[PDB]
Amino acid sequence: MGHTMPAHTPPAQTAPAAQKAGAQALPVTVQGATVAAVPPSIRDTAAYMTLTNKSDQPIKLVGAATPLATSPMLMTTTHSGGMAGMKMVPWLTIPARGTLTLQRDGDHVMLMGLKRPLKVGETVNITLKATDGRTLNVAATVKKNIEGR
Ligand SMILES: [Cu+]
Incomplete structure (x- = not known):
């Protein structure tokens, strides 16, 4: 039509790369979980692992169910993650900007409460469950990684 494409006009950027940009929302855990074979x-x-927020909404992840551990307990001791208490919390709400790093003491x-024997190099499914109404199946890689450190 003049400049009615097609096309966009658009591209001075700003269709981006869309595609996907505009975001929609990326469910805020674009992560490949790893689990430590017996410390x-x-x-x-x-x-x-690391929760990698790319939506900026107050999500509350409260599940980590798996044929791995009997007692999947959420914990939070980093002043930018959930909280400052390496204790059996409710869970960790990510108040937008959930860019926190899940590490053994941080x-x-x-x-907790390992069921069955694990191989360094295996992979077991995890089902997480955010009470925002997620029930997400993920492949968790079973290897200790920088441990006995
Ligand atoms: Cu802990």
């Missing part, structure tokens, strides 16, 4: 600290263990999930 030198009894069967109990944790996930080693906010995490304690996948």
Whole structure:
């Protein structure tokens, strides 16, 4: 039509790269979970991962169910993650900007009470459950990673 494309006009950027840009929303855990094959600290263990928020909404993740650990307990001791308490919290709400790093003693999930023997290099499914109404299946890679450190 003049400049009615097609096309957009658009592209001085600003269709971007859309595609996807405009975002829609990216469900705020574009992460490949890893779980530590038995630490030198009894069967109990944790996930080693990072929640990567790309939506900026107050999401509340409160599940980490898996044929791995019996007692999946949420924990939070990083002053930018959930909280400052390495304790069995409710869960961790990510008040937008959930760019927190789940590490053994710096906010995490304690996948406590290991059921069955694990191989460093295996992979077991995890089903997370945010009470925003998510029930998301993810592949969790079973390897200790920088442990006995
Ligand atoms: Cu912990």
